[PDB]
Amino acid sequence: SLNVIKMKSSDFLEKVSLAFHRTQGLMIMKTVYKGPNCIEHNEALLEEAKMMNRLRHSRVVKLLGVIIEEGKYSLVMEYMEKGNLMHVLKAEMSTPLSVKGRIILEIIEGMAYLHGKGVIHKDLKPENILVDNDFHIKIADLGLASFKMWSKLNNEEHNELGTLYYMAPEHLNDVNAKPTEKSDVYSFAVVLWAIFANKEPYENAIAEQQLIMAIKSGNRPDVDDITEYCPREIISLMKLCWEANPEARPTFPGIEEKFRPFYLSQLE
Amino acid sequence: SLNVIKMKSSDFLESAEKVSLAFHRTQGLMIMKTVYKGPNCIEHNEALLEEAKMMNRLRHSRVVKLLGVIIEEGKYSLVMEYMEKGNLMHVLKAEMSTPLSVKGRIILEIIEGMAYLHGKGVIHKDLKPENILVDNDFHIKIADLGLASFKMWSKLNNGTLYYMAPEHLNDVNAKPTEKSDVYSFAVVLWAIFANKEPYENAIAEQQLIMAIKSGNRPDVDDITEYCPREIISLMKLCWEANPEARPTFPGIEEKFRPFYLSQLE
Ligand SMILES: CC(C)(C)C(=O)N1C[C@@H]2C[C@H]1c1ccccc1O2
Ligand SMILES: CC(C)(C)C(=O)N1C[C@@H]2C[C@H]1c1ccccc1O2
Numbered sequence A: 001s002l003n004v005i006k007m008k009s010s011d012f013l014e015k016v017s018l019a020f021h022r023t024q025g026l027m028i029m030k031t032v033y034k035g036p037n038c039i040e041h042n043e044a045l046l047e048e049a050k051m052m053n054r055l056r057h058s059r060v061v062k063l064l065g066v067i068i069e070e071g072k073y074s075l076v077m078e079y080m081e082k083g084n085l086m087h088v089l090k091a092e093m094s095t096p097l098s099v100k101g102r103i104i105l106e107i108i109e110g111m112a113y114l115h116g117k118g119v120i121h122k123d124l125k126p127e128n129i130l131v132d133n134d135f136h137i138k139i140a141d142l143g144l145a146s147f148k149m150w151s152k153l154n155n156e157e158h159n160e161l162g163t164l165y166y167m168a169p170e171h172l173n174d175v176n177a178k179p180t181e182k183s184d185v186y187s188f189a190v191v192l193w194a195i196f197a198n199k200e201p202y203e204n205a206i207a208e209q210q211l212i213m214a215i216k217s218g219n220r221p222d223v224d225d226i227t228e229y230c231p232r233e234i235i236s237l238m239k240l241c242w243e244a245n246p247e248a249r250p251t252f253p254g255i256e257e258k259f260r261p262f263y264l265s266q267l268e
Numbered sequence B: 001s002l003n004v005i006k007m008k009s010s011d012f013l014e015s016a017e018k019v020s021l022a023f024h025r026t027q028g029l030m031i032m033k034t035v036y037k038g039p040n041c042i043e044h045n046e047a048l049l050e051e052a053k054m055m056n057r058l059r060h061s062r063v064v065k066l067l068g069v070i071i072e073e074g075k076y077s078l079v080m081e082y083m084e085k086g087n088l089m090h091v092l093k094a095e096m097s098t099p100l101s102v103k104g105r106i107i108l109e110i111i112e113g114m115a116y117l118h119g120k121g122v123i124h125k126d127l128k129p130e131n132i133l134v135d136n137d138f139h140i141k142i143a144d145l146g147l148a149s150f151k152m153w154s155k156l157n158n159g160t161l162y163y164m165a166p167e168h169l170n171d172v173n174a175k176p177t178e179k180s181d182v183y184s185f186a187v188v189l190w191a192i193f194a195n196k197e198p199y200e201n202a203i204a205e206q207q208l209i210m211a212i213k214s215g216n217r218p219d220v221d222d223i224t225e226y227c228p229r230e231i232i233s234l235m236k237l238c239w240e241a242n243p244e245a246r247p248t249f250p251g252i253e254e255k256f257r258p259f260y261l262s263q264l265e
Helices: A039-054 A085-090 A097-116 A148-154 A181-197 A208-217 A232-241 A252-267 B045-057 B088-092 B100-119 B151-157 B178-194 B206-214 B229-238 B249-264
Strands: A016-021 A025-034 A063-068 A072-078 A129-131 A137-139 B012-016 B019-024 B028-037 B066-071 B075-081 B132-134 B140-142
Touching (some): A072 A148, A085 A129, A085 A181, A097 A181, A181 A252, B045 B075, B088 B132
Antiparallel strands (some): A025 A072, B019 B028, B066 B075
């Protein structure tokens, strides 16, 4: 029941790709490695897929299974029709405030679950917030930031196969700094901004070193760039969550206790 | 935040009605369940505080939050959040009939809440409509008002068998499981659509007890309003005699959530 479903390539009728399972239906296959086989790390890879399978929550992307074969390594996850959050925000159909409120709440719920399971995301951004046809979201880890062996497998010498806007300032120009829960909270602040801006931040930045050094100095996404009606409470929340000092930023349970009654009274 | 807030009676401005409504000076409207009042007796306080610490761990939108605890000379109280519309049965028996879309959401919220508690190693043991509180916007939270999970407060404090699984009827020594709560959820499912307590409110006599043990269940034909086929199958599945036949709440949620979205809302 709770075990990892080991899948085979032969289960699929027919590198992130859409894939149809013979009984079970339409799925998404992220093929991590294709090349010469090495069975030495298969035990560790499978154990990481077991860890992936344990993280079950309505706002977290479920691993439906894993293909571990001679030379091919793939993760199989559920289909999300509308794609990532930024694709939805940049679309010609404008997403209403009530849905945006629910999205934010769902992101908080999902991040609160993961932190409760001892999982720091390290790489929360609109690209990792997938959206289904009914505008409900699920948090993903598409670049395998939380999963060392699959991440090493992806960047392997024989394998025949990022955005700094949401990264907390403590991690900009500092590879040694160990990510915390508050690292993801910073990212959530900029995602909050993006949701109401309907765009990526820092458009007026001319160079990368300019931007990096500006963010480290205290510079943040422009609140005056928000053309839509964003509430005062949400502007306070993002301002709180993007504080320079990580101790000043709240926890996701902290965010949820404030935001949920606001969503109920105002947004829905 | 994160630790049990030891509160004082002096933090409350008044306490209008032992469950009573109470206003905190800095934190607004709350509910005070005063468990014991009278002569003070230490040698439970260490254990009582530790149990209140266990209560404090359980944070979830569909679970009643313990906002704090009063442990004073003679007075012992649990302080929890206010749910305006009262328990689920009060809402179901009200003159305004609750629509199917809200009932679907209630069921989903009950599942979410129960799934959280099982995930935290907490068997309820006493799930029923009296322990399902309802806010002004018809969202629910699961409660443990009889203190079934908290032995010392329950002993400090000191009868519906309609939601109790047959394995517990006439076997008080039997250790509860997750499937015990799933049985209870089945009868709650029945109650939600029946709009009443099951078995014609008959006294929980040996005839009834032994009938339930033998296979007897709440009458599905007593549901006069429209209940979907899926929900009738679910309650029938969840009240199976054999606990191994009954699903898990995660099992229920995986099937029920898409059903709620397509059909019920
Ligand atoms: C399959 C894939 C790696 C893409 C994923 O997104 N997840 C697997 C589990 C659950 C979900 C997930 C999200 C975020 C962090 C870890 C994590 O781990
Ligand atoms: C305060 C009171 C005892 C009435 C309660 O309902 N709960 C405290 C925690 C959270 C919530 C709760 C619900 C169900 C089981 C345990 C439990 O424990």
